[PDB]
Amino acid sequence: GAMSQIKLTPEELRSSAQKYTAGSQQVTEVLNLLTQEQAVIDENWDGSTFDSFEAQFNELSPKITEFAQLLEDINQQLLKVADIIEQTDADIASQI
Amino acid sequence: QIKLTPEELRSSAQKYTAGSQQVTEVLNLLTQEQAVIDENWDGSTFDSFEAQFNELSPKITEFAQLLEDINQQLLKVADIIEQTDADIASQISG
């Protein structure tokens, strides 16, 4: 099962995990910033010249949030798996 | 009609192109991490996360490109307006 199938150590899992959570935060930050810029552009540019970009942004936006949530979810799972493996190593060590 | 000056337009554009780049950076970086996990975790347990990531990836690419396209248009419009503002100033003064 998992103990056999997983080759990464708890430390290696945590190292990967950190990249996912940093990535998730960066994606969220870009989305929030540019969602604000879209509004600014909408309010200081009367008309409909910008309507097509607005709509593309709006359609993709929820997908970007899903991505960010996925990356954070991967972080959480990796961390929990690392903990479980680490405790396992500890228990097996004691047993002998 | 356009309340934003060319300088304000370029300031906004810079945020779009930096966002584009940053989003793509995260995608590329974690695409390699996905491969690390795939290679070092045998079996199908991580298959769902792999599928979800692979499914969203193309949208992340579309979004990054949308961001850059917006940047490029903002720059073009800023240039147009810059020339316009100069032409009008020169008209009135001259």
Numbering used by the authors:
A (entry chain A): 0 to 95
B (entry chain B): 4 to 97
Q: What is the paper's account of this structure, in its own sentences?
A:
The sagEsxA-like proteins form a homodimer and the structure of the sagEsxA shows that the driving force for the interdimer interactions is principally hydrophobic in nature. At the inter-dimeric interface, hydrophobic residues are prevalent in sagEsxA-like proteins although there is a pair of hydrophilic residues Y18 and Q36 within the hydrophobic core of sagEsxA. The side chains of these residues form hydrogen bonds within the hydrophobic core of the four-helix-bundle complex (inset) and the presence of these hydrogen bond pairs between Y18 and Q36 is indicative of the anti-parallel homodimer arrangement found in the sagEsxA subfamily of WXG100 proteins. As a result, this conserved pair of mutations can be seen as a fingerprint of anti-parallel homodimeric WXG100 proteins. Therefore, both the CFP-10 and sagEsxA loops are considerably more flexible, which is reflected by the presence of different conformations in each of the copies of the asymmetric units. The CFP-10 subfamily is structurally more closely related to the sagEsxA than to the ESAT-6 subfamily. This is reflected by a root mean square deviation (r.m.s.d) of 2.07 Å for a superimposition of the core residues of CFP-10 (residues 11–83) and sagEsxA (residues 11–83), compared to an r.m.s.d. of 3.43 Å for the equivalent ESAT-6/sagEsxA superimposition. Secondly, by examining every WXG100 gene in its genetic context we could clearly show that all WXG100 genes from the Actinobacteria phylum are encoded in a bi-cistronic operon containing a CFP-10-like gene followed by an ESAT-6-like gene without exception, whereas, all the sagEsxA-like genes occur as mono-cistronic genes in the bacterial genomes belonging to Firmicutes. Interestingly, the sagEsxA FRET signal could only be detected after extensive heat treatment. This result shows that the homodimer is stable, and a FRET pair homodimer can only be reconstituted after heat dissociation.
WXG100 proteins are a group of proteins of approximately ∼100 residues in length that contain a conserved “Trp-Xaa-Gly (WXG)” motif. To investigate how specific sequence motifs translate into specific structural features, we determined the atomic structures of two representative complexes, the heterodimeric CFP-10/ESAT-6 complex and the homodimeric sagEsxA assembly. The overall structures of the two protein complexes are similar, with both forming a four-helix bundle, in which each monomer consists of a helix-loop-helix structural motif. However, the novelty of this contribution is that by using the iterative bio-informatics approach, we can show that the WXG100 protein superfamily can be divided into three subfamilies: CFP-10-, ESAT-6- and sagEsxA-like.
